[PDB]
């Protein structure tokens, strides 16, 4: 029937990612106005973003535990509940710690919801994991593009608190409704030889090489997500140009995931990782120079950088499922989400402080160096490292 079809659950996962896209990708544009009204330094609001992403490292493995053992329905229920709680009251904020706490709660919900959607995609498509991961990550990267006008129209017409409460209610209700339908391909759990547990995966050096590579890659991407608009203005760009640039970078970032997933399906995923990371390092090294050329040059740099960076969010979950089994995959990708959070530590507050004290060029140099490190690890270290033995 319909509920037995393989691609229906992929569509449900993409819908879930589309719903939760706004929580993370609406920040790129609204970080500066939130700083302006709160009257605090940019590092404060960037640290709020950092907290929202860091709590995901402790959240996503927790939800993945329940998803792996008992199924994804109840975990998705309470993840949607947490997202609803965080986003609904986000409008009535007038203090810095209130924003900190509410955004952290919303991020904690978003992390487990993302983990569930990606796990559903990967488990439902063992033969094509790159493509399913790419479609799901594309849903996560592109859902902000239609969502942002809707909340923006409500803010001008009805206000801030009403907009946040209404969008949070809609997202939570839709996530709860989707949690009724989604299911795993099986319908208990059986462990095979290729299934690595949490401790067994953490033991092998392959997992930590991948973790370090993901941590190094996410530096420039997350710093751009946090501070493209302030850096763009430091380049001397009008508000309209920066908004068009944010839309373009979001579009390229979202559209890259299916393409890089298809490449990772048709070629070794490690070689795709190496190519993507090398291109990202090249773009980040050249970013201050080409971006200083003009508006078109800056926006093109942004689009290429986000293309490369977002390519990895289909590369890594499929690699994790391929290498360390399928029955343990949700909480297994939670530990890579931990690397994402550890990189978001620099992507937000720490990178903002680095830019404040030494200029944006210093932070961009840091991102380029970390991207080169990740390129070195992916291209030369891990392809000859073999598969884990356990």
């Amino acid at each position, epitope marked *: 029937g319909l509920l037995g079809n393989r691609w229906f659950y992929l569509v449900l996962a993409v819908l879930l990612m589309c719903m939760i896209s706004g929580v993370q990708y609406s920040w790129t544009l609204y970080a500066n*106005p939130v700083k*302006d009204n709160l009257g605090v330094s940019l590092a404060a609001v960037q640290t709020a973003f950092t907290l929202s992403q860091v709590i995901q490292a402790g959240s996503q493995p927790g939800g993945g535990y329940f998803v792996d053992k008992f199924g994804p329905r109840i975990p998705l229920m309470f993840g949607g509940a947490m997202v609803l709680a965080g986003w609904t009251f986000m409008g009535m904020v007038d203090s810095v710690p209130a924003l900190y706490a509410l955004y952290t709660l919303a991020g904690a919900g978003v992390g487990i919801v993302y983990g569930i959607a990606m796990n559903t995609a990967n488990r439902w498509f063992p033969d094509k994991r790159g493509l399913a991961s790419g479609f799901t990550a594309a849903g996560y990267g592109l859902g902000v593009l239609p969502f942002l006008p809707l909340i923006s129209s409500v803010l001008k017409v009805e206000g801030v608190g009403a907009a946040f409460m209404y969008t949070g209610l809609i997202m939570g209700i839709l996530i709860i409704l989707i949690a009724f339908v989604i299911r795993f391909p099986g319908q208990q759990i059986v462990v095979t030889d290729k299934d690595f547990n949490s401790g067994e995966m953490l033991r092998t050096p392959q997992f930590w090489v991948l973790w370090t590579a993901f941590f190094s890659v996410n530096f420039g991407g997350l710093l751009l997500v946090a501070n493209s608009v*302030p850096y763009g203005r*430091s*380049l*001397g760009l009008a*508000a309209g140009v920066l908004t068009i640039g944010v839309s373009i970078q979001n579009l390229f970032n979202g559209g890259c995931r299916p393409f890089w997933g298809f490449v990772s399906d048709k070629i070794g995923r490690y070689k795709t990782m190496s190519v993507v990371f090398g291109i990202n390092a090249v773009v980040l090294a050249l970013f201050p120079t080409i971006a200083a050329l003009g508006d078109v040059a800056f926006i093109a740099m942004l689009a290429i950088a986000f293309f490369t960076w977002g390519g990895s969010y289909a590369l890594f979950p499929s690699t994790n499922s391929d290498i360390f089994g399928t029955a343990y995959s949700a909480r297994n990708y939670g530990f890579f989400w931990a690397a994402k959070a550890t990189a978001s530590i620099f992507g937000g507050g720490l990178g903002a402080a680095i830019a404040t*004290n030494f*200029g944006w060029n210093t932070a961009f140099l840091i991102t380029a160096i970390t991207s080169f490190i990740a390129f070195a690890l992916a291209t030369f270290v891990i392809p000859r490292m073999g598969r884990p033995v356990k």
Partner: antibody
Amino acid sequence: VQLQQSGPELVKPGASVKISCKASVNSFTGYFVNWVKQSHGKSLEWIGRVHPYNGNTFYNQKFKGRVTLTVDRSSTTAHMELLSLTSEDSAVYYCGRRDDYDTMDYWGQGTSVTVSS
Amino acid sequence: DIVMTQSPAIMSASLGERVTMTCTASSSVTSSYLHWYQQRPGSSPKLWIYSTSNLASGVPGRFSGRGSGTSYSLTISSMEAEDAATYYCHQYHRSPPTFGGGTKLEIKR
């Protein structure tokens, strides 16, 4: 985009001062209106800022409730009203358009207000 | 707040010379939130440099702006008669915004 203010003002101490600032067709598109003062042509210090649409007000602690900024709702003029005149209130007041980064793109010629018994 | 001191307060430079003035802040300022305004003696303040690097509309290219952290500098490659004015730096790292003490630039002869 151009900004025009009221003429010079002579006011006895303790009275009310009302300064107008006229704007162009859509000058306050995504901009606040910022009110700043210059003491004697040597020092700049911020008075306040107001949103031309929301009416949201942000004021310095120097002028806590002394000053009220109000936009005319046609996005054509903004008014600064001060009410606790003392000796150090004699200065020139400037209105400007202020984007999200506190950059004041365009200013007015200024309005010289003097308190004199 | 954040106190900004501009040095020197009054300076004299010969026509055609290279002019550099500095604006030091008490705390670190994010480079996107520090601007420079040039005020002629009889006229109103005019936007000159925004976000520490970029010149406003209708500004000659001889004007340069550098700086990061706690120190910022406005530089003129070749001094001109039209460049003689007062320069105010403007910070918005944290509310409330504050302005510098001003640098009075005069022409030597």
